[PDB]
Amino acid sequence: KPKQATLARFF
Amino acid sequence: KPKQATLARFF
Amino acid sequence: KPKQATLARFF
Amino acid sequence: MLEAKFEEASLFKRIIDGFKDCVQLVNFQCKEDGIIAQAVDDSRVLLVSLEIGVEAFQEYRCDHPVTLGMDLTSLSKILRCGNNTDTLTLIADNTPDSIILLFEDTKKDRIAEYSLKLMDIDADFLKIEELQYDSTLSLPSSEFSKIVRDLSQLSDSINIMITKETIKFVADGDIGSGSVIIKPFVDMEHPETSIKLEMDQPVDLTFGAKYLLDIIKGSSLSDRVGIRLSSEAPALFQFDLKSGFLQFFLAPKFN
Amino acid sequence: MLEAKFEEASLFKRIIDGFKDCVQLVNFQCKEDGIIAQAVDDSRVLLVSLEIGVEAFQEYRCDHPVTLGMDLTSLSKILRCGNNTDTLTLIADNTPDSIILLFEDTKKDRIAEYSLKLMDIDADFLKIEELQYDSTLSLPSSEFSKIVRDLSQLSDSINIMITKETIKFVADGDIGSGSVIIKPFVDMEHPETSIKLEMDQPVDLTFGAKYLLDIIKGSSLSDRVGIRLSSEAPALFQFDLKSGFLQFFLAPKFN
Amino acid sequence: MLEAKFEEASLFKRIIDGFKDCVQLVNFQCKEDGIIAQAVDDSRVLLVSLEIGVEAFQEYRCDHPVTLGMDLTSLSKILRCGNNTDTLTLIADNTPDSIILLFEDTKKDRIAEYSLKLMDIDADFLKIEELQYDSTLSLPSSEFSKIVRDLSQLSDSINIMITKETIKFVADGDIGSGSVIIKPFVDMEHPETSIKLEMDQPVDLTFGAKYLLDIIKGSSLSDRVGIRLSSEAPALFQFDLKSGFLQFFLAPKFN
CATH class of the missing domain: 3.70.10.10 (Proliferating Cell Nuclear Antigen)
Structure with a gap:
């Protein structure tokens, strides 16, 4: 199961 | 704010 | 008031 | 001998629904010109007053004044049994310990008979009237x-x-x-x-x-x-x- | 190879709803003349007995007797997915570890395929019948x-x-x-x-x-x-x- | 002077319902080409972005850019008061501490006026756009x-x-x-x-x-x-x- 990324990776 | 009266005031 | 019987009485 | 026969069982059900949330135990003074009831809430702020109302029944036989002390939660439970719509007649004797609630359907036999034990209050009978309103x-x-x-x-x-x-x-x-x-x-x-x-x-x-x-x-x-x-x-x-x-x-x- | 295809997905949904609240884990003995299931509640007072019912399906292919042990809560969750109305076909192999529940819409592709892991009970298969009733x-x-x-x-x-x-x-x-x-x-x-x-x-x-x-x-x-x-x-x-x-x-x- | 008059009070009610469960406090940047709003949830995973939309109002008067920081729970409570259907106009001055929400009925007087104290965030104004999607x-x-x-x-x-x-x-x-x-x-x-x-x-x-x-x-x-x-x-x-x-x-x- 993949772990949840945040929206920080894209800003 | 006004405080709540009872119904004793009228009997 | 009658007490609850189980279904063991019939098998 | 009380025989308060409602045309509609929902009618009494709807009446009691207007009371139950502010007052729990209440006397219902039955007369021959209908039923009067009255109760105060615990905080002594709200007074509820009911008047039925001969013309709101199908029939209303009541030989002598009779007081029915009822717990409204218990009464509600019985008034949920009204297969709507059904005729509901309240029966109680002259010196009652209980109240019979009879549900009859237009096409019968589909008769339901409920009995409810009375409680005695111990009330005010506070009939005071009426004021000049601004x-x-x-x-x-x-x-x-x-x-x-x-x-x-x-x-x-x-x-x-x-x-x-x-x-x-x-x-x-x-x-x-x-x-x-x-x-x-x-x-x-x-x-x-x-x-x-x-x-x-x-x-x-x-x-x-x-x-x-x-x-x-x-x-x-x-x-x-x-x-x-x-x-x-x-x-x-x-x-x-x-x-x-x-x-x-x-x-x-x-x- | 089991292929119990219901005409209506609600039909199986409605069946399982009649069980779930008294019994949780239950075996569904699939035969070729339909599905028989049976379970006792924990207090040993109520026995539930199901019989479908070839004629209640659209189709029912079942090559060899197959037992499907299912948790009814899990089964319910899958039976909530029935886009009503939809055809529901139960698929399971001869020696199954899971049951495939396929939902197909009349106009497709709008196909839903669910899989449910089986549990093994460990039951009675208590087929006893029938009494003389008064x-x-x-x-x-x-x-x-x-x-x-x-x-x-x-x-x-x-x-x-x-x-x-x-x-x-x-x-x-x-x-x-x-x-x-x-x-x-x-x-x-x-x-x-x-x-x-x-x-x-x-x-x-x-x-x-x-x-x-x-x-x-x-x-x-x-x-x-x-x-x-x-x-x-x-x-x-x-x-x-x-x-x-x-x-x-x-x-x-x-x- | 802001005058965002919706044709339907449910329209704004329905908009806010799409936000409230992921984001609580959010700035609503009012311009003259409508209202833009944007907020990130606490886990920094979901960004919500709103754009109304001059043509979605009955009218939209907004003399100068105005930011309305609102708690969406409070806003919801006021948007439950929409006697559907009713016209809803948002009024706010150039340097506001509160927002007036006026509900008017086609046949009046049946006018409702609500006031809501604003909160100041303290946001990003994160306008970043737009990507190449596979x-x-x-x-x-x-x-x-x-x-x-x-x-x-x-x-x-x-x-x-x-x-x-x-x-x-x-x-x-x-x-x-x-x-x-x-x-x-x-x-x-x-x-x-x-x-x-x-x-x-x-x-x-x-x-x-x-x-x-x-x-x-x-x-x-x-x-x-x-x-x-x-x-x-x-x-x-x-x-x-x-x-x-x-x-x-x-x-x-x-x-």
Whole structure:
């Protein structure tokens, strides 16, 4: 199961 | 704010 | 008031 | 021998629903001109007053005055059994320890008979009437209901203000404030939507929203609510049975 | 290879709803003449018995006898996915570890495929039949449902009494008592409302309302409920699929 | 001087309902070409983006850019007061500490005036746009809603897979697994039921069901949902106002 990324990776 | 009266005031 | 019987009485 | 036979079982069910949330134990003084009941809530702020109402029954036989002390929760449970619609007749003897509630269907046998043990209070029989009100108004009950439900989200207190040709409901709190303004009108094609006002002098009253939320439960009884207000008297909220009434008397917030 | 294809996904959904609240884990013995299932509740008082019912499917291919042990809560969750109405086909192999539930829409592609891991019980396969009942009756299921729901407010025990031409449901408690009396009738224009009675001898039985509240959940399955009662045997409550049945066997209260 | 007058009070009510469950405090940057709002949730995974939309009002007077910081719970409470249907006009001055919400009925006086104290954030004003998406699709919002609600019972993670002419939603958990497969189609007589797909390359993404359950609350706004997905970018979920939009940006599950 993949772990949840945040929206920080894209800003 | 006004405080709540009872119904004793009228009997 | 009658007490609850189980279904063991019939098998 | 009491025989209060309702045309509709929902009718008694709807009456009791208007009481149950403010008052629990209440005496029902049956006479020969119908049933009068009266109860005060625990905080001594709200008085509920009922009057049925011979013409609201199918039939009403009552040989001698009889008091029925009933727990309204228990009564509700029995009044949920009304297979709507069904005729409901209340039977009780002259010196009763219980009340028989009989449900009969138009096509029978489909008869339901319930018995309910009575409790004895120990009440006031507080029949006191009637005051001079500064202003009296009537509006659709469901309209008054929405107004109360809406403003109640804003504050524990709701203000009622009557000026010339204006009825104004105000709430004020942390969130912010809210004002509903309604003016008298008659729509000739839909007179049941009408807002009527009679003013002898202006009124600025402030009420506990806790109690008004209870009062508006009388909405099921009548499509109209009558409201009478005084500067130094309790407010009167009234839903009209046809005929008879359910009444609420509320003490306002002072100082 | 099992291929139990229902015409309606709600049909299986409605079947399982009649079980889930009394029994959790249950084996579904699939044969070639349909699906039989059977389970006892924890208190050993209620036995649930299911029989579908080749004619209740659109199709039913089942090469060899197959047992599907399923948790009904898990099964419910999958049966909530039925986009009503949708065709539902159960697929399972000869030696299965899971069951495939396929939802297909008439206009597709709008296909849903669910998989459910099986559990193994470890049951009785208790096929025992059938007794001599003193009285047997049938009435509208929704009618029997209201009767049970209503009386349940009064007592933990509900009494069923059959005399000559009379079916009588009685509850008695702290609040007070309650009696529903229904007589046999046929309405020729609405035969589905009919109350039918066959009596060999009178019956006075007392049942746990806890269980009857569960039993009446079979209401969704059939518009009629069949009730067979004996003086010294478990009661049989039966809702008829067209064709097949859902059955409940209840132990009464003695002494 | 802001005067955002909606044709329908439910319209603003329905907009705010799509936000409230993921974000609490949010600035509403009013311009003269409508209202833009934007907020991130606490976990920094979901970004909500709103654009109304001059043509979605009855009227929109806004002399100078104005920021309205509002708590959405408080705002909801006021937006429950919309006597549906009623016209709702938002009034706020150039340097405001509160926002006036005025409800007017076509036949008046039946005017409701609510005031709401503003809070100041302290936000990002994060206007960043726009990416190259591998695939973009549109389907009925209620369809996408059911798909999400259903699969969510099976797992905390929902997988979205786009191959050639195929949109595939997958969930996998303890209970078992579930797969919804939808193919592009147009029904010429009911174009609102259509499923549209544009693919530049396949996509295999996995999303938190917690967030998707929130996203699908935008269902009330539009009967269609647009979904744009990238291999290394946040997903875009969009419900179209007529005209304007509500947008959701979601971070997927990696490694």
